[PDB]
Amino acid sequence: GRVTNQLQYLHKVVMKALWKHQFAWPFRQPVDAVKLGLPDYHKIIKQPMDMGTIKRRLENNYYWAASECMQDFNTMFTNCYIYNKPTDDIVLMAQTLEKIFLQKVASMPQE
């Protein structure tokens, strides 16, 4: 639809909801493989993404299309499912956030 209305919705509705969720705090800033002691993070994960980057991108008019911003969200979730083992707590927190993301996206404006 209208790119501006869609991106405002991603920022004002989708992102604000996910940012304030009780599972959000591991994703407000980039993964720090050193401090977490993740030796092979940047080996296995080639496109790191966090909610802080997406937020800054939305606020700086980085995106040309809602689907770009949606792709960055998806990369953040996908990175988490890939680097981690199926039963780590972060996997379930990412899954919880991602479902809300898809719920919200189903109500994105088209004009």
Ligand X SMILES: O=c1cc(N2CCOCC2)oc2c(-c3ccc4c(c3)OCCO4)cccc12
- What residues line the site for Cl ion (CB under 5 A)? 89-90
84 binds, among ligand X, Cl ion, Na ion, none (CB under 5 to 8 A by kind): ligand X
Report the SS3 class of residue 71. helix
- Of 26 and 71, the one with the shorter C-beta distance to Na ion is 26
- Hey, what are 49's tokens? 């993404």
For residues 23 and 63, give the distance between their C-alpha atoms in angstroms, rounded to a whole number. Answer: 25
Please give the size of the binding site for ligand X, defined by CB under 6 A.
10
Residue 83 interacting entry, from Na ion, ligand X, Cl ion, none, C-beta within 5 to 8 Å by type = ligand X
- Flag whether 40 is marked binding: yes
Measured over the CA atoms of residue 1, residue 27, residue 101 and residue 68, the dihedral's sign is positive
Q: Which residues contact 85 (CB under 8 A, 6 or more apart)?
A: 91
Going by the annotation, the residues of the binding site are: 40, 83-85, 88-89
Contact positions vs ligand X (CB under 6 A): 26-27, 31, 36, 38, 80, 83-84, 88, 90
